[model samples]
Target chain A: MASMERFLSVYDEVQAFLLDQLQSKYEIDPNRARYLRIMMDTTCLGGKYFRGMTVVNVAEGFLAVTQHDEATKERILHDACVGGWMIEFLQAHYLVEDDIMDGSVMRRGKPCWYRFPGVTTQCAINDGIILKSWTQIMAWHYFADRPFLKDLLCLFQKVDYATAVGQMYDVTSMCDSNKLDPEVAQPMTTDFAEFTPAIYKRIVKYKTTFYTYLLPLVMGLLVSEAAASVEMNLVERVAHLIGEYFQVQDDVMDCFTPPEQLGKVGTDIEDAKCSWLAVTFLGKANAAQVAEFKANYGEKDPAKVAVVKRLYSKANLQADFAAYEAEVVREVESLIEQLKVKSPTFAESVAVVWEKTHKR
Target chain B: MASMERFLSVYDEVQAFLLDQLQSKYEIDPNRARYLRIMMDTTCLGGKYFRGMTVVNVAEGFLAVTQHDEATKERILHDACVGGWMIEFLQAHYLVEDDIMDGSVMRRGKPCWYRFPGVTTQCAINDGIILKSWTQIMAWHYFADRPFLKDLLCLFQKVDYATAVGQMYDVTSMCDSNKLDPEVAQPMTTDFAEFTPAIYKRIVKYKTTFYTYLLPLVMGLLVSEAAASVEMNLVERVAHLIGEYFQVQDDVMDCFTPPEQLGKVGTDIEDAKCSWLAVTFLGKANAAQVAEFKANYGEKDPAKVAVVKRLYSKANLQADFAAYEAEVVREVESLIEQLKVKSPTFAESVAVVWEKTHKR
Candidate 1:
């Protein structure tokens, strides 16, 4: 029940900041400002906002112990929004471009940015770059004086590159190496445990947890002149586990969430997505079941949809999802016990993070 | 010819610097260095290298006056390459995305980046961003203590936004207002003097001239302690003319230049390009000729092509081109005379510049 409340709280700063940023630019010139506002309204509103909230929830734990004053808290919140927006921004940037590349018509209950009346397809592509660049600009300008800025900037570049490389593997994995059949089903096509499942998880950890959980936490330490705390390393281990749990649940929830509520069709199916659930179902299926999947996985036939439902039902995806959720909670609790011995700052962080992850 | 000699000389310096910068990244890991080297090879080669040379030429002129040591001159050339590569990198970034966006197949005599075996459409988009970011990394790493590094960094950002904005306008202009008539054929529909044409010129100027000419020369002035030069105003005016001359001649020659030498067809007609010569022909055409263009401009038939050609020929496009050529030469010569009053350092630049511009 607290998921909705805490989720809104985590992202509230970014929501306000984006509006303010857009307004400032608009005051300089209204038309340009209005155009971007429309873009944000369509794309930003629909995301899970998990990455940002995870950062906020994790950082809040560190702040509570450090007992940061109002000014320091505000600075942490400001930087947290930059980190949050960067993760969401990276996701939306690719999604918008992919819609054009994949030739999809709708996203988040509205037309793709390229499909707008006055937008050229090219503008949609460049908008992706602009979105990502703004993240770097915001980080550089805000943290220019901080000693840790270089490492922080480098972390973003490194993680973003790894995600891109993972996508490279994803696209290549789709093709049949020796055959010319453009429609030939790929051999061993759905393996989420390898690259695909880990791709989003790794990105969120580097992009979200590092910035949100570790950096902000560490930044608090550095600001408070406590840089040598032994708990820093231990906190990262737990933070990464929480991030992984969050992304896996997200992938599982994608299938069940309604279009109106979620703001998009559960397109993980149509996209030939390598979500953990999809791969697990495929691996567990018999040969006939695999044939049925290959026939219907990426197609739009309604009859084939019934077949996919039957397969997923047989796989008991909901039970699998429940088990996955319990495993994450168990691992995180043990991590908390370990942290208590390391530092009260880290132990207090563990309790707050447990509530944040579990409540969601 | 000195042109080929000039080309090779600049190429060697740029390649060496680029390779060195890349090799330095090996400190991160030799394996990572190898992967980056491969990515760089994929995107960085097959470029004209003209942009860097323009910068070096201007910087050389400025260097001669202040007589900065060889190391400063080398640094100036290095930054010029960084600026040039920044443009090339940005262009490739766009090219990769544009290929996916437009479904274009070939670029610069090679397959699009998206077409490579290991590349996904998503990674292709990401690579484009990395290329742009690397230019900043290149600048920051090389010039961190140069006193003007921050300005140089900001210049790259401004150039990026300017070019991206121009691209948006160009893309928006190409499509039909209402999506019903996917057919894009009419007199004004393809003309260069419209709002689209204005933005197209702006795009070329920023993406080409500023990226190609102005930034390098201005940066050279700042770094070499010659930012106070009164001669810079004239230098910009003349350099801009040379740039315009280059684009105009490129278009005119496209009409008659051999395909092998030109390296591409005269697709400006098919692309509905808004070059100056095209605008000049329309400006001079009578009502009947204008009507003819409306009927045949973007039509695909050879007869339609013949009709457009007949109209262009009737408007004396050849003479118009020659007349414009004469005007540019005289204008440049007059500017050179004025430069003589200022200093031969600047005057000699005009002579060398006009000689380059007058090549065709």
Candidate 2:
């Protein structure tokens, strides 16, 4: 905790270095360069750098027991930061393409990369592949000399598989109405909740939780070889639930939070986004309310935005979502206090979550 | 050449097995299954199996003199075919996503995978990744036990890098909009034979030659360790020129070929594609014709398709393109003859140019 601020400074340094590397490689033509720059911009836009800090927190925990000395701690922490940022980079790649496919205009208070002036007419898909390829290349280069090299590569492969699976779940949840051709077959929507809150949570867990929560700690624990056996399963489950709450809270804030603080327009309804908010809205609304809800909220009409707001209020959905968050956090915190640790990593990691989410 | 047919049959069988593996693994969710199936469908579309054929061909060539036994040849051929199809599958992964990114409607003979009713929505992007991941998994499963396992794995890395680099070039070239976006910074009106031809050839090399022609052969040569003294520099240079002819002919046929044969309803011009035909037409047109060409030929207007057709006639571009093709093909044929391999494998591969170019 004493050195958390230093981790952020280092993360910025590494991010800038990586961005420069990408720009130099990708900025082939001015138009292409312009579009690539937008991608780089969007990737860097927001994030509390909690995962990046978590890496160092784990490193410090490992060193506390090993008495690994300052330089060894510094090196491990640096490696952890790089590993954590790789996870962040993977997230950016998925989100950018998701935003474009979802027709989302704004993200984190600015235009999404695909919505950039000249970029709209261009295909951002290849750019998306480039972003993904970089994740592997970066991981390989950064970790090649480490003892964790092969294991890290395998870990990344699993993370990639998990994320791709989640993306498929999240995307197919919003089944296209124009799916089959006239002669092929008729199109009908499937169960949205099974895909969203249920399957999509699986996606959110596989895609977000494992990497952002488990990976940083696991990598450190594996390197330190200090992760408690009884504590591991509980840690993973807690991390996953936190990630679920994290995403749903983001979704809830899209409609509930002020635009200035939220930093972007919300398109969950307009874009037919299959978020937890949408799942809850569908579950809670009555039959008449569903019809009225569809009329106003379904089209993402600016005029009907008010009606959608009213329905959320009537459903008391935001408060319910908050209470759910409270339950998970309290349960996780209680579990963390029970961990038998010679190293302080477990408590330190728990404090990082409380410091951010508990403040609000 | 007696065994070439059987080898190809083996390739198709292997391809089918790999496709099934993907479908079963990816199709756990119906929507996801459909998405993966669409990518597989598009990827498995027409190929001469020439790339896949090279693997067995080269392996046989190497084993011909040193080891003539069926068991050895069968083992070598199996390894070769798997590796060869690995490159082909990688190409499919790139092209499926490329077609979507380029907004291509028809590929091989049907709508691009992304435009397919069930799979074409948001999930197509992730589906492409699944397609790519299969190659690595297959390589690990099949090649890890082979004597030259390390070589095969490294080749996969090199092949992925080469393909991704080629893809970067393709995406960069597509971003150049001479006819569509008014803000295009490149000089628009140019001599068809000079700068535009230069640009068109560069695009052809990036989009077609290196990966399509050189990759398969190089993989064959690398793994077989045969024809050690044969100069590959000669093969690559001539093959590139032939690849240029092949892609250019594809553009020309897109204009004149029977609708049923080509399968596309002729949207290339309308889509503002970076075709050699477009560049060649612009290169040779008079100032007024160029103005008319830009206005009508950019593919935005159905009425202008005919107008652009008329302009191509007025410019005498088709004949000029034909002349260029004849010269390049003749040069490639002559180079193939110089190699003078007694085995028909070399001759048959050379004849791929004539077989592909001539109308059935």
Candidate 3:
């Protein structure tokens, strides 16, 4: 593994770059800049850096060494940081709106940007846009002359579009009055009967895999100029499998992990989310158990949640998730084994992601 | 003015281009495309097309003619349509969010897109972003290989940033609990004491001038290969003056135009908007009259609106606006005269805007 000292400094560089560019390139008004500065600080900062750090890490591990010269190496590393920050920028943009849509009260152990004093969902919406705007600007600043520039921009656009569609699907399932216009017909229902493994897969793959796992890794390959030889479909397939495992783990943790540990109470059951546990439990439930599950599935009462937990225990969802997690790990391992010969760095990156998220 | 038959067909061409490109280039999902299609139809279609048409007309008028071949002419005209659509895209993007932020109920004589059946402010926010996303995608598809690509991207970013800042200023003055985060400090007041001409000028220049007037003209120049010779500051200076007149006319119409004619009742007073008339009235009124004006301003009642209207009549705002319009026309005329030697199309485009907005 490469030392992370260089990677750590990338965050600082990107921050300074954002502030400098907003002032110089956009020539944003000083007054508005004050608000934008607060937005940048709150939204883009304080992430775990797992996804962002992967950008530089994957790029470093994958970049084909065309030149061993120090100058070229420095420049490549600099571009790698830019690539990393771009992902961070993308995530920051998505998360701001994601919080607003989800009715989330907190993120990164603090109130979500929209919940911050003096901020409304309207400002949050604009802030999301500003985050996206700067990401593109930074992309051009670093990669304008590179041959992969167009490809990079296209990839960003495609993934963002996919994520938006995924969000549409997710929001459709949650029939909140405040989140939707009254005029459109809503297919939303409290019935756990509507939940399906196929629908869950579609939501996870589009919403998570492309941007979360595949984008950073693919961006690395593209920047390394090794994209010409790599089969992106193979990369995406492996990444999607890994993303499924990540999401399933997330769903499992929501029910099982304590609120203090998770930093927020799990609300998927309360919010009528088509969670994996819900789908899995329904698959195994008897008629009487199904009725019990339906009655308590989305109820916010703590007693109702306890009743749902009892049904889950009766259905043995804990053992089911354990078996499921192991099966997904095996599949991801097989895919990584197949990729080991051609792109060891990608294989290693996959292994690292699996290792990181698979943990409790 | 030159024949707009070719330009008229550009609308159809751009619409097809939008549909075709969204599917092919970005490879957007068919399911999500449904929402995007509605967004395009609602936001981009049915506008007066003043800013968008300027892109084509100016391009056709100003493109440096080296070869008079029909094939080359066709390519130029096609590019002109692309430029026009880009402006249309930018405007569509801004208008969607603007409608949401302002709580505007109607646009183009129908319920605003956010107010459409099944649409929420959340989706409208995304639609605004989707509009912005496609605008960039369209730019890259048309001009990615061209020399002016960077300039075009920068122009889009700059104008959008300016517009966002201007919106920040405008939204800041109007205190609405529905629009803002609950925690930020708000100094919102219904009194006209804070309304100043300087603030009005800043809002119009950044919000209206940059996007509406300057962007289309600058984009045409960039596409025509004349961006090198043109002093953009000079163009912006002239454009801002015209934009001021445009906004001032809009303010006047909000009060004087019938609800049926305007497609919605003007709520500038109730909304606590810093209108030109409000500032003008405050400056001219005596202490007693100022007190009277303050009592009536920002009240939602019909009688209050009547009182404000009467105060406007007393202040002779109509005559003032007339004189102001003539003065602005002379200033624009002088600038156009200077530009005529090098760019007759720009001059003509400016003349067209003045004519269109000046009439009725």
Candidate 4:
């Protein structure tokens, strides 16, 4: 808890440090620098910093202050925060571009950057480009002399690549690729043939899980020099299961929970995403229900969206996920059990996040 | 000469190798893999291969097989081509996003990838992401064990950062940042205050020069270990000068050349770019001419573009760039003269490209 708190406390300083890099190191035009600072603040700072905290948590797990001198402990903890910010910066990069790609209007309760007067599709795109590189630049600035620096760079890049792959799968499934015009004025009908868990699993695995779950844990481990052993293999295996379970659990909640309860409207049906609910619904629905679902899915009209939702509720898909969630938990618990024998700290890496996500 | 020819010959093979990586290595969905292959083939190939060739040229100069064994010669030349593709891959990454940002419909005499039926703004954005990381994956695949792999990765990254910064300067100038509706359907008025040679120099130096002229050259030198010498200092300095000169020359040609001559329509006036011609015309135009230029500079309407072009012709800006070109050549030749004293091969590195550009 001290490590996550320490990590959050350093967030303001990390933002300021990067802002200074724009003004001093790069001689970014004062006007451009001002806009960038606004962009970074608007996009990067407001989130929960879960990924960054994971970096600190995993680092703190391995380099427990109780086991090290005060000087060594403080230095490792501070560097862990730097690594934490790197992952957060990367997430911001994805969010910026993702907002543009999804035609989103708001993010984190504020207008999306692309919606801002001075920021449009292109500006948002370039902002993503800048954030992407700044993450690596921060790593180079802070840990250039460290041996594991290359490992960190490689890790960030691999995660970034996987996330984009996941995004491609998600976007591709939403669009009717076999159709002639992918971007017609009206919302396209959902191609039900592609709405399988096989596709849904691939989409979330690459898109949500790797960056959200695996990246933070590995970043923390790598920064603390804890990945140079058999521990890395265990962490990597456990990360995917946790990531999948986390996403599937969240996807189901998105549909069943109210906007007031979730703090956001669920548009998975409207967006025609290959979601877990849709996949499970596909598994259970009769021929008549499937016909009705096909007609209503991916519609923008409120009445049509409600039809899909009513069908979902009638099918008791929430109950399906509740049962599915129980099964997924056992699977993850099983992995964590094995991980504990292999490396107790690595097992806690899964358990800590598992408790938070599973409790919800 | 042989090296450049060999590099050009392998263009097909490189594209195939990367496509296979997506299919076999990544197990990318068949449809997604198809789109990616099309995106890569459309954007990465069909270029002049000058950047890739520069890598070969520099490598050939440093590791002339006349001095080394045939095995070493063939191996280095092949590796040089691999590095060449790395730069080209990076270039494709920029071009994909640039097309989306600029809202252009065409590239390399074909419809832009973003404009394709199944590909839109977001798909193109993801494609750019793929290209960006693929370049690094490529370096890691071919040269991971080499000492200079870090140098090459860092060079690609540094150049990418500079290019985005330059794009910001370019886009920021074209934009009326003070205007509330930055994305008004109509072209916003170009802010004349931002149209200066000082800003133009910055835009091209970063946006055009580094990745284009500088990246391939430095990539070759680094891969060949020539960068380990003082040659790196010479290459970096000459790179900026050559990049600036190349862009100014190209910018001037865009306006004066016919569509059939340039093989593409010039949109600098329509796009409201901080092109060299506009900056130079600002230096010479009268108050009334300046008003006319401002009203029509960024207009998408053909007549208004003609108004801006006529102003350039009246201002004799072509004559201005001709004079500027001579001055730039003298400046570069002065550096190359000094570079000859430092290393003759390094001087040729600048000279070979100089001959092609200066001849034009």
Candidate 5:
């Protein structure tokens, strides 16, 4: 709870920094100034700073920062917060684009940005583009004097590209690959051959893990100037494991949680998403269950979608999810235990992510 | 002729560089590697290297590059070309997004990227995201050791954000501003008051002028290490002038040029785009002309659209266009003339951009 509070405390400074930066240039133009301010607020503000806190919380425990004086601790903490916020901006950017691309109606329990009163599809696209610009804009503003500016910028771009490929994979994983080739000249077809657990993990690694897990962890390490304290390979390996863990929970939550609890309707089935529940169900289902799931997984009709949910329940995935949770906890704990021998602070930083991600 | 030939010679190296850079990381992943290569080609290739050429040509005449030995000329020339192609990459990123936003059918005489076989809206959106990533990816790769790397990256982000704002201007310029507020629940209504010449110039300056004309030119100056050779304010001023001139030509061509000569069918009238011809005609139309033009300008009906085209003919916009061209030529010529006093190479660099954008 304190992590959440401290993580969000930096919001005011970021808010002021961005508003001043934007209006300084467009001071004479009210339309641009108003549109930008509103767009930034609408897209950037709502989400709980979970991922950002992931940055600040871990950065706070870094050997470099923890060993320093209070002033230095305060210094890197704010820098870590900026990194946290930029990742937040990056997330918001994807949501704006994702909502429109999916033609969805609700995000965070309200109309999607494009569906807002005066905003249209065109407005949404440009705003998404602007959000990405601000992701970098805020980074350069805060890290202007850092020696590792290039590394920071490159990391953003690299993860951006990796996540895009993952997004592409998510959309196409259920599409029949033979028909995906441009030479096919036909509409994409849905198939399960492309929905194996291996592919699911691959998609999760690129789309969710790299950005969500590894990206923030790396940002914290770099922001604290403590990257050398943790082995690069160690950070990536642990980050991927935890990020995949998060995605599995997300997939399970989408199916199990109702709209009142989940904030929006889960469309994993309706939209043919290659979600964890779907792949996990396929892996263990009997012939009868497999037949039912294959028939109902991607159906849009409420009745058929309900059938897929029942199939997931029939497979008792919540039990398996419970099982996977314990398995991952033990596996990740072993790795962190090893990390503790060499660097206790590094292990503490990583444990912070593991506990939060595993908490729910 | 040699400028065109020489400007394009870098294409082979650029193509190889991008392809190798992309596949190296994705070597084990065929789906990603293949998708990336195709998207790169679809978006990067084709299009005369005019914009990219502007960078290379300008950089070629820089006092530093020209005064160097042949190897150094080759060195800077290739760097300039890389800058040129990245601008091309940026342009493709927009077109991909713009095509989807407009529900457009064609681009570069072919189906819009979203409309390509097996490539749906989701793929187009992700591909566009990837393209923007590469724009930075390629920049950092090529300019890794340079002192001005930050400036180059920041310039790219600045222009990207500027163009996004301009794009918003272009899309919303015709929508009633009062309705743009989120509180307004009614669908956006088209209004000409927001489509004034001033607004048109604002849109063109941000959307068209900054990226297409000024971006490449600035890239040239930076890549050649000749940025200090030319005045910053001078480059922006001249760039805006020539870019606005190009937008007017594009507007006129959209209506006047037949589909055979133009690459694709024009949608300025149907889409209610804030075109130069639309704004200019509004400046001089009589009550009868205004009544008909207002009713027909943004209409979907071919007969009504034809009336708008005829009104432009009746107004003799070509004669007015010819007069404006002469006026701009003299105006821009004088600006370059003053630059010649300080630096002939800078003047020649500016001249290369002027001749190309005005050649139509």
Candidate 6:
């Protein structure tokens, strides 16, 4: 609950920061300013703010361990909020681009920004670029005078490049699958045999784990000047395990969750996404199940989607996911337990992400 | 001749820099690497290299006056080349995004990156973003140790923002014109009477002038520590006037030049682009000419294009452009002449751009 409060406050701060930054430009072009405002609100505001909260929560944790003076803690906390907003901005950037790449019709209950009546894919692309530019610009504004300015800049640079690399993998895998099919009318085809757990892991690692999980926690620690107290490897290990599980849950929900619950219809199958559920289903499915999957997977017809759902049900994937979820929770807990004795705050901050992602 | 040699060598350096950065990732995902490689070669290479050259040429000119030692000149030349390549990368970034925005089929005599078989508009957008990320990454790598690192970072931040803002204006203007003709399945219903030279000037100044002309020269001067000697206002003033003229030439060539000469068919008429000639013709046209313009402008049909061309001829737009070109040349020449007395190298460098862009 406190994390929600922290996230909301930081969200407001970032929204204000974005508006203020674009204010001068807004005067020059009100039309573009309006589009940017809607984009920020639509893409940036409504997501589960877990990435943003992790920055503030973890940075606060680090400050608790590293600083005693209330004045110093207040000063550092203000700066940490900026760091939190940076993560929020970065997430917004990725989502705008990802929505276009995925050809997603809806995100967070609204039509994708690019799918908005007048917003073309071109403006969406430029808006995404602007979000990225602002992420670094804000970092410079907030941290340029700080000792870890280079670290902050480098952190953003490394994560952005890594995320792009991961996106390439995801996009190319889909493209490769499309190439195998070669039907322009039907761009996506079911190709389970080629999909592997190794590729799945790499996608999650590059796209989800580093920026979504590892970055916020590490950035918080760095900004708080508490790098010496926390073991970054342990932080990464805990964060990534949680991240992988979050993505797996995301994939699971895409199929199992109703549109009302998820806010958009899941099109992973139709889009030929290399989703964890699809990969897991393929690895474990019998020949007949595989045959059923091949017939129905990636088809746009609603009946075909239903057929795949029945196939997933027949495979008892829900039970398997329950088991998988339990196992990952235990492993992550064990890693956090190792950190609890020496760094309780660090462990607690990670646990907040674990609880937030896992509960959903 | 020496400028040509410098441009070629730096082009190669930037090319190598791009390859080396992606090599490690290439090993991991050979498919994405191949895409990135093609994108780099397609977008980065084969340009006139005028923007890239100006950075080096201007920096060299500054170094000649500022540094007497051959060793120091060599040292700074390498740094200036990095600045030069940054401009090239920025150019590539814009072209990739612009090509997609314009729905262009060809750029630099090859299929647009997005038009390549199996490449979607999505990956092109991401690739454009990646190019931008590397420009900053490379800047940090080369200039991070220098006192001007923050300035370089800020310079990129400012230019990228300015360019995106300019693009938004360009895109929104086209969209606004489209909105006026929801029948523009009817294609643009002659809004030419409403289109003004002021609107045309604003689009060109922001879209072309800032990134293309002013940025390269200013970035070079900054890298060479010559910002103190040359007033930035004068730099921007001269660059923009030349830039406006160049876009006017581009508009002229779009209609007059054959596809073979331009390496792509021009669609400014069909696309209802805010071109100099279009605005000029509207301003000068009588009632009958205006009636003819309305029927023909922004039509995809070749006959329609011919109709618009005849109207331009009737308005004597070609003669108007010639006079416009000569006036801008004189204005730019006078600005450079002022610099020539005090900063001969800077003046010479600016003149090189003037000649390259003006001549062809």
lDDT of 3 by residue, A137-173 (tens): 7887778798888788778877877676566666655
- TM-score of each prediction: 0.73, 0.76, 0.87, 0.94, 0.93, 0.89
Docking class of 6: acceptable
**Against the true structure, what is model 6's DockQ?**
0.34
Q: After superposition, how far is residue A58 of candidate 3 from its true place, in Å?
A: 2.0
The sequence of per-residue lDDT tens digits that candidate 2 reaches over residues B1-360 is: 465677567556765665565456433444444545445655754766666676666566667556457776676777777777777777788777777676777876767777765555465667777677666666666765665654555545544654554555544443433332322333323233322777667657755776666666666665565535346666677667767777887888788788788866666676555677778776676789877876775456668898987877778886887788678768877777765554344545556544654443
**TM-score for predicted model 5 compared with the true structure:** 0.93
Q: What's the CA RMSD of model 2 in angstroms?
A: 5.7
Q: Compared with the real two-chain complex, what DockQ does model 4 have? A: 0.43
The DockQ scores of all candidates, in the order shown, are 0.20, 0.22, 0.35, 0.43, 0.57, 0.34
lDDT of 6 by residue, B1-360 (tens): 275676668666766666676665423554455556667777788877778778787877776567458876775777777887888888889888888777799887778877765566767777777787778778877787877777877777777777777787676654454342211222233455436888788778877888889888888887887877776777888888988988898889888889988989998888777788888888888888888887887779999998898888778887888788788878998999877666777888888888888887
**lDDT string, candidate 1, B1-360, tens digits:** 243354455445555565565445312223334444566667767766555555556566776667667777667656555555555666667666667655555666566776765555645665666566566555655566777765666656555655555454434443333331212221235433352435445545643555455554565455545555547678678767776777777767756677666654565555555556557777788887877876776555778877877777778888877887898888888888887876676567557756765774
User: For candidate 1, what is the DockQ?
Assistant: 0.20
Worst 10 residues of 2 chain A by lDDT: A180-189
C-alpha lDDT (0 to 100) for residue A92 of candidate 1? 72
Judged by DockQ cut-offs, the docking class of candidate 3 is: acceptable
Q: After superposition, how far is residue A110 of candidate 5 from its true place, in Å?
A: 1.6
Q: List the residue pairs that clash in candidate 6.
A: B183-B186, B184-B187
Q: Candidate 5 chain A: worst 10 consecutive residues by lDDT?
A: A182-191
Candidate 6 local lDDT, A153-173, one digit each (tens): 877788888788778777765
Q: Native contacts recovered by candidate 2, as a share?
A: 0.17
| Poorest stretch of ten by lDDT in candidate 5 chain B | B182-191
Ranking by lDDT: 5, 4, 6, 3, 2, 1
lDDT score, candidate 4, position A288: 95
lDDT of candidate 4? Answer: 0.78
Pick the winner on lDDT between candidates 2 and 6.
Answer: 6
Cα misplacement distance, residue B95 of candidate 2 (Å): 3.9
Model 2 CAPRI quality: incorrect
User: In lDDT terms, which candidate is top?
Assistant: 5
Q: Residue B231, candidate 6: how far off, in angstroms?
A: 1.8
